[PDB]
Curated annotation (Swiss-Prot), chain A:
GO MF, any single term: rRNA binding
Cofactor comment: Binds 1 zinc ion per subunit.
Family annotation (InterPro entries): Ribosomal_eL37, Ribosomal_eL37/eL43, Ribosomal_eL37_CS, Ribosomal_zn-bd
Cofactor field: Zn(2+)
Function (record text): Binds to the 23S rRNA.
Zinc finger (C4-type): 19-37
Classification via PROSITE patterns: RIBOSOMAL_L37E
GO cellular component: ribonucleoprotein complex; ribosome
Family the UniProt entry places it in: Belongs to the eukaryotic ribosomal protein eL37 family.
Residues at which Zn(2+) binds: C19, C22, C34, C37
Name of the protein in question: Large ribosomal subunit protein eL37
Species of provenance: Methanosarcina acetivorans (strain ATCC 35395 / DSM 2834 / JCM 12185 / C2A)
Curated annotation (Swiss-Prot), chain B:
Assigned protein family: Belongs to the universal ribosomal protein uL2 family.
InterPro entries, sorted: NA-bd_OB-fold, Rib_uL2_dom2, Ribosomal_uL2, Ribosomal_uL2_arc_euk, Ribosomal_uL2_C, Ribosomal_uL2_dom3, Ribosomal_uL2_RNA-bd_dom, Translation_prot_SH3-like_sf
Subunit details: Part of the 50S ribosomal subunit. Forms a bridge to the 30S subunit in the 70S ribosome.
Polar residues bias spans: 1-11
Chain's role: One of the primary rRNA binding proteins. Required for association of the 30S and 50S subunits to form the 70S ribosome, for tRNA binding and peptide bond formation. It has been suggested to have peptidyltransferase activity; this is somewhat controversial. Makes several contacts with the 16S rRNA in the 70S ribosome.
Single GO BP term: cytoplasmic translation
Species classification: Archaea, Methanobacteriati, Methanobacteriota, Stenosarchaea group, Methanomicrobia
Molecular-function annotations in GO: RNA binding; rRNA binding; structural constituent of ribosome
Keywords (A to Z) from UniProt: Ribonucleoprotein, Ribosomal protein, RNA-binding, rRNA-binding
Organism: Methanosarcina acetivorans (strain ATCC 35395 / DSM 2834 / JCM 12185 / C2A)
Chain spans, region Disordered: 1-22, 202-223
Cellular component, GO annotation: cytosolic large ribosomal subunit
Listed name of the protein: Large ribosomal subunit protein uL2
NCBIfam families in the cross-refs: PRK09612.1 (NF007180)
Gene: rpl2
Length: 56, 238
RNA sequence: UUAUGCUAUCAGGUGGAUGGCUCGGCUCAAGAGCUUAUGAAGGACGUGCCAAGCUGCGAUAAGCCCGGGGUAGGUGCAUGGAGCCAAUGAACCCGGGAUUUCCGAAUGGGACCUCUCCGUAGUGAUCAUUCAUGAUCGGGAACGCUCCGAAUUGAAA
RNA sequence: ACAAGUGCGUGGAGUCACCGGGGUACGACCCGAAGCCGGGUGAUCUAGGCGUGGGCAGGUUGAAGCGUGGCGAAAGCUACGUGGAGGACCGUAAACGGUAUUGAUCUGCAAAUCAUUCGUGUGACCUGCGUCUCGUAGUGAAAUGCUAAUCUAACCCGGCA
RNA sequence: AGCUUGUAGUCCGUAAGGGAGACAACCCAGCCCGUGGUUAAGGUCCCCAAGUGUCGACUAAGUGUUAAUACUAAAGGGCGU
RNA sequence: UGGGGCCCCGAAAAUUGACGGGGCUCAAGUCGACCACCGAUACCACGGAGUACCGCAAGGUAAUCUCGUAGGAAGGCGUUGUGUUCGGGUCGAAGCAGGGCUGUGAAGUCCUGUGGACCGUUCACAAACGAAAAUCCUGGUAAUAGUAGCAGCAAAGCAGGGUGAGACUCCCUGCCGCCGAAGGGGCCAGGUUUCCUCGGCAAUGUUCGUCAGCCGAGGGUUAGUCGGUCCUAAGACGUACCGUAAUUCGAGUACGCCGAAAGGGAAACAGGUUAAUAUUCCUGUACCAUUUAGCGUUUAGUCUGACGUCUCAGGGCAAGCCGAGCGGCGUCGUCGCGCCGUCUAAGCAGCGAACCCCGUGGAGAGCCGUAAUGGCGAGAAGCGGGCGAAUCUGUAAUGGCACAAGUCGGCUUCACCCCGGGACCCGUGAAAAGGACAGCUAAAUGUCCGUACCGAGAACUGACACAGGUGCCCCUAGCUGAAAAGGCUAAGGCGUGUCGGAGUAAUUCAGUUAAGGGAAUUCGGCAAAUUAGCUCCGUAACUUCGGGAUAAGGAGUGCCUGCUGUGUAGACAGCAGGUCGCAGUGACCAGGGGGCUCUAACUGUCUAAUACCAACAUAGGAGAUUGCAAACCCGUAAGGGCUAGUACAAUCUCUGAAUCCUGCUCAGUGCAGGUACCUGAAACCCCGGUUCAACGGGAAGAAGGGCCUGUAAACAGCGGGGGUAGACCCUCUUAAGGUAGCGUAGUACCUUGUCGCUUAAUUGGCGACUUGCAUGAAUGGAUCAAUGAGAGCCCUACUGUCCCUAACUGGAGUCCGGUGAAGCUUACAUUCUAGUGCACAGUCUAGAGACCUCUAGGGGGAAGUGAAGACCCCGUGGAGCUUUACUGCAGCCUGUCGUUGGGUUGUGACGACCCUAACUCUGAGAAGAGGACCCCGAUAGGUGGGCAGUUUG
RNA sequence: UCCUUGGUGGGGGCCAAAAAUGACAGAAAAGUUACCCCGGGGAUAAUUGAGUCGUUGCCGGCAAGAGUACAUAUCGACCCGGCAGCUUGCUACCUCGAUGUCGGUUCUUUCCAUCCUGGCCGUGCAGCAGCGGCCAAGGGUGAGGUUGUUCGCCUAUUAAAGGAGAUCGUGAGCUGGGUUUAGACCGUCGUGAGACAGGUCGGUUACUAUCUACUAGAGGUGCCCGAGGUCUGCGGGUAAGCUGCUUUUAGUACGAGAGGAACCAAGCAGCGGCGCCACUGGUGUACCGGUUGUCUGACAAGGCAUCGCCGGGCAGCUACGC
């Protein structure tokens, strides 16, 4: 058995579900937090200054 | 940062090093009794405690509080358990050590009054009441230390049940594996010389050896205090 | 009639450069500058006679009503068939309203379930108070204030 | 600083622009690595712990215990039957693993698979689903192995031109 | 040692054209374009333009037909001539 | 005899070859001279260009100017646009292909063709301003090439008739086949319409195709009873408290809430119906829950839900099988057999086997039992009674069956259900909802979600219609057979593990057979071959007494006739006679065996994707820390892991079963303790200084260090030289000189050490000796039965491994029809030799060969392709790791200040003592135990590779 | 001189002297990497190649002498001069955007400095058998045990069982035994990570052939009255054979004896070459027979299980035959 195509047929399950707040498939099913908008962790939307570049 | 030791992983509290707390029957402690109070109870059954690999007695008291108790040797079903200072010095009874005659055996000793029992709890261990004084009382513990305890520290008379458990050799890695399933301990354990230098202080090299003295100081930091920690001496008895 | 070929040109194919155009973009300047529990932004689903995407709208669903402008056509990007709307002044633009499913600060409990359970019909949490009522919660391109806070790199180490 | 010698300066020409050359710092003619640091992502793969389930064709061997009978004065010795123990044995193209052919294939069926030959196959077993442990951190019966085809320090974006 | 490290001059690097079979730096030559002429180096039996050239000898081994040279064998011997 | 010229011997090299080749002999060689000619861009001359300087300009001079890399300087050409001048264009602008002319050239202008709307120029000015190249980037497109692939693991199709314009490929029929314990049936996750009907074939399908999981259109999923829903588990999430500079961040606590489509669980079955739905819709017959009403009650605390692994008895049943009758089909050369069917659910009513309980009973020179263990005056057997299963019987009885029979007996029954026993555990094998004990009758209500289809060699995942994985997850019939193995057949699914024809080489992938020899092959028996099932006889060394063991070495085996024994029975075991063959486990299936060493005890684990090992782990042994407010560890903190724990424990290490053992060294380093003396920071105190301090000293002195002691199953170490016939006086002794053992080793340089067995011969194997470059005792030593896909050697058996290859089979290849890529490539290229050239040339130089094109072949060459070398060096490039490198930072130890109070003595503020009242811990609290200590904030010193950044020229 | 002014303590400064960086035109500074990574280098090494030849292999001159005598049958000191480039060196010219690195195997070729076969000369050659030298590259030069080996030893044959070159010929041919990765053990070093030109066990061999070369098979044109047939021979190739054993010569020549040849002739054998299938052997999935298990209802006839397995075998092909 290998790490390539042999063990990639075990991908019959999910770790991210479609989040309510943003409709993106980023809601982790174990931590209960969307990794795109942060629903289930915070009221505000997660946005960081490293998501774009320094404006200079 | 060379990788943290097994002790640091255990102290962090990961699932590999956590005790399976749901497997155990009940926390063992003496029943809560107010000062100048007592309660009677009878044994309704001898069960098996996975936390200690020794029997524990299910005792039903007079106020109806079904409480698991640590089983001294010889305790049976239908026996009456008594607590308090007025309780007779009898095997299985919970009394202060200040009333126990010197030379008797006690177990599940309390560090402080109304403690619930800390010392002398393994399968078969016992303590000896050495001396009585007004503020103190000496008990010879299973290690050998003459610990000085308060005269009001309760204890159940007799040696702890399940004596002789370590007499049988393990004889097979599966038997110890099955014991360690219900334990918090990690099984099996890799020797530190077989580790790489990133993992342990003693790892690495072209051949299996520590390269440094295995007796480590008491003032060592965490992640370095391995081997023989703060040894008074080493080796077999010459 | 010398095939397979070679070189130069010509005609055609494939191809989409050059040229021309352009309702887009970028940069600079000048104004104006908050919104949200009276439920936002954002999202899911629905929504068209024939309608898949986008856009708009929300079971009144590419829409409804009222005051002003405009006036002969209208029926989105996207002048197809058949109908409909409009001189009771539409379409379109400005202003004021109505409707505005579910989630979302999401707020009666619950989310791998954008739905589900209780219905005794919902003010969840933290607060102020006369305990009538009220505040905060989220979003906003950057700017503003407070606090926490690296390394690459330069010194030719 | 006393002295005498000499240094620098002194008999009025600079300043501000346009077009240029060059030096210096900033991404500084353009492209080119391993890396270092901040914040987030990942245990659908794989490693380990836990909860709850499912599995292991068909045979073999025959531990303790028990019954009956022999041998002895006793102590004890002993045969057969029964018994169903074991990280026991053989064994499947059940399952798991992956020895040798250094065969096939190597712009493959396949970014490691196929054939024959093999190891375990009642247990330190295999495995479904659930849940947990993670980046100087986790896990590791320890190879620097594994942590989503990536590991002597992952991946994504940012410091970064 | 076609090695390494200096010194004087001249070269290649940065050097055409002509000639050594080809030759970075060996000889003529330092070179704007076209034409005519004559020479340099070197060659004149053919390949190849011009000598089967002249005089006096040597070599008999295909020796040789190889200025410089990283491209060319010595010591020794020969009543070979 | 000496001095000379040329030549000769000395004189041998590897593809055929080099005076440049032909060839040349009073020369076409050598020497001394000579003549004439050839031959450069030089020199001369003529005409022209540019440059340098001078001249106002015309122009003047240059034998004394004209080559050119890095580079400096000057002058121009071109693209796009701005200001400004002058303009061109549907009587045809830009751009594009070719061509003429000008210019040294950059480039400009003009002409021919096409085109359908803009485009230049003077003088100045700006720039996202000029490409041939960066393994440059994006796009398009070649050569390879009509080539490889469309083959290997399941070699599958043929005849007739259709449909169709078109048929190997689609449909029907027959024949021949594949799977048949999976390629069939059911469904989880996942997919998401792939499901079903109709119409098409531009793309998809490894060919075509009228076919299709494709394209287009339409349709399809119906629940009180199946699941979700409800319950709780491992474990998440929320609010509050608390922490944090702060949070969306963090452990714990309290209250909640979620967490399983395979755990628990209230209840439905049979038949019909559609193209696709069916325990859901329809027919029949039922059942469950909640609420409302009528009739009365609690027993209310228990039981059930509810439990591991192994083994086994008894009972039932699906499936299976046999005999009789009955109804159809097949066969029918002869026979009378073979196959199919002969059906019947839940619900309702009834009986109830074991176990358990109750009333009697009276059992010992012992009796009653089970498969087995067992039971008994603490009361067995026996007799009654109660509680009590699966299934069975009766009804449901009319449903479907061609309304064709439809009725009966027997055997067996798993792996399914009920019930009971036993054994094991240093494993003890879940909880909660729900359910039972007071219910009976009536009526109404039972919302929401899923329901199609695939579930995999084509519906999932791996880029794919992927030989993998997910799933072999749960079921699977007849014969053989121990069997679910393998072979042959049902049912069921398929001829789609989606290219065909053809039979003609070499070569190749996988097989069959091979005389005589039998490992002579090879690094090595790698590969292949041998043996193989069952019964019986028999079985060695050695051993931990368990084993080795299927050791080894042997015999039998079919079929037919007739019987016996055990069992209730299925079935099992055995015997006599006859008989066929080369062969009776006739195919399939199925160990070759043994001996001596090394190593590890063993089962296990391991570098997924080159290492299945002797490495890791293991039980066993030993050591160390810690009395629990602990040791060890995490966190900044709040608070935590170990821990629902307590020395028979947890944590930290070394060694690695058992057997015999484990010697000396504490000098170095480490650790622990003692601390008399020395050193030792800050605060406090005293002196000097300061109109005050900074500052300089003194006193005292914590931890730490020096110092002394213990410690080696702590890190570690355990020696040479001279003699004596080599057993002694001494050495070399900065602690000690290696004991038991083992020894050319897995360690041994010399080395292929020396001797014996093994072989004709052995750098080998084993045994012995061993002066050991450089063995040795938990850095564990020696040794070891058993085990081992481990590493060597030997014997037997076997064989195409070989002598030495041959023939045959299937798939490729060759040829043909269809489909159809990729990789190398500056250009040219029909080469061969030698030389030269950066010293390894198809392209240069000189020769020699060579007509071109195509097919097949295997690979000589293209220093063939893959690829910015991984070996070596360099880089004031990195990373990881180490440490008595440099500099630091956590952790830990300790003095002082604060927290921090009250009384007593001994001193001049210091040390001790006592108290409770802050504070800490425990408990829900009463209260209990410590207590001004500890913890905590700050500061001073130490230890400190635990961690960080760097350096190591 | 010290930040408004004056002072006091204490700092700052000018000039000069001392304290040191020895890597001495001045960093406060240890290792390891085979777990390694990255940027480059033929600016620089292992590698092949080229140059050179100390060393290695092979020789020559002069002959000092030994050889009973006698330098030169044979050996050839000292000293001197060479060739080859086949051993090890030296060097750094080519290659680090790789020329796949030892040994074996397969196949082809080349040099002669010849081991055997062929021809001679000398001898201190009686014969047999040696010894030394010259010519000669047509053929031959093998099978085995250890070792990864090259080399070397050993075994029995043999005419002999030569050496060397071809990128230490030959990995788009093979093998993978050794060396040169990642794992592990032993010993020795190092406090340690780790290292050893020490040993041991284990350890991935990628490619569809464009051009050229060769091997064979065809299609064209060129030459030519048009076609056919039979020949010639410019040329190309060969090993088409090479070598032993026995008999005869002859137990003769020679020799005191033992021992013991050659010329001619014959047969057979080893290897090589070419060809063939009467005989023998192999195969022979055409075919025939026996038989196991199972299916088609039984017999008969058939399917499948490697041709199910087993026995036999014609033709064909082929060697082990001729
Ligand atoms: Mg910014
Ligand atoms: Mg360390
Ligand atoms: Mg710097
Ligand atoms: Mg002075
Ligand atoms: Mg028995
Ligand atoms: Mg097995
Ligand atoms: Mg990975
Ligand atoms: Mg970056
Ligand atoms: Mg010169
Ligand atoms: Mg020059
Ligand atoms: Mg020249
Ligand atoms: Mg220049
Ligand atoms: Mg270009
Ligand atoms: Mg074919
Ligand atoms: Mg079959
Ligand atoms: Mg097609
Ligand atoms: Mg739930
Ligand atoms: Mg082992
Ligand atoms: Mg081990
Ligand atoms: Mg010792
Ligand atoms: Mg051998
Ligand atoms: Mg490079
Ligand atoms: Mg430098
Ligand atoms: Mg460090
Ligand atoms: Mg730095
Ligand atoms: Mg390592
Ligand atoms: Mg080759
Ligand atoms: Zn989201």
């Amino acid at each position: 058995m290998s790490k390539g195509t042999s063990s990639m047929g075990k991908r019959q399950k999910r770790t991210h579900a479609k989040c309510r707040r943003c409709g993106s498939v980023s809601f982790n099913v174990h931590t209960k937090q969307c990794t795109s908008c942060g629903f289930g962790k915070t009221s505000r939307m997660r946005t960081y200054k490293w998501q774009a570049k320094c404006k200079y | 940062m060379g990788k943290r030791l097994i002790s640091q992983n255990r102290g962090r509290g990961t699932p590999t090093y956590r005790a399976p707390s749901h497997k155990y029957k009940a926390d063992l402690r003496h029943p809560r009794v107010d000062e100048n109070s007592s309660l009677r109870g009878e044994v309704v059954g001898i069960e098996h405690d996975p936390a200690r690999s020794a029997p524990i007695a299910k005792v039903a008291f007079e106020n109806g509080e079904e409480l698991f108790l640590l089983a001294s040797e010889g305790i049976a079903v239908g026996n009456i358990i008594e607590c308090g200072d007025d309780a007779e010095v009898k095997p299985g009874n919970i009394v202060p050590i200040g009333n126990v005659p010197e030379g008797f055996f006690i177990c599940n000793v309390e560090s402080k009054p109304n403690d619930g029992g800390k010392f002398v709890r393994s399968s078969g261990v016992y303590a000896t009441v050495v001396t009585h004084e007004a503020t103190r009382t000496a008990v010879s513990m299973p290690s050998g230390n003459i610990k000085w305890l308060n005269p009001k520290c309760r204890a159940v008379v007799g040696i702890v049940a399940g004596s002789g458990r370590v007499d049988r050799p393990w004889l097979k890695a599966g038997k110890k594996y099955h014991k360690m399933k219900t334990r918090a301990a990690k099984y099996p354990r890799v020797s530190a010389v077989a580790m790489n230098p990133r993992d342990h202080p003693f790892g690495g090299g072209a051949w299996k050896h520590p390269g440094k003295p295995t007796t480590v100081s008491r003032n060592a930091p965490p992640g370095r205090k391995v081997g023989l920690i703060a040894a008074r001496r080493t080796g077999m008895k010459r």
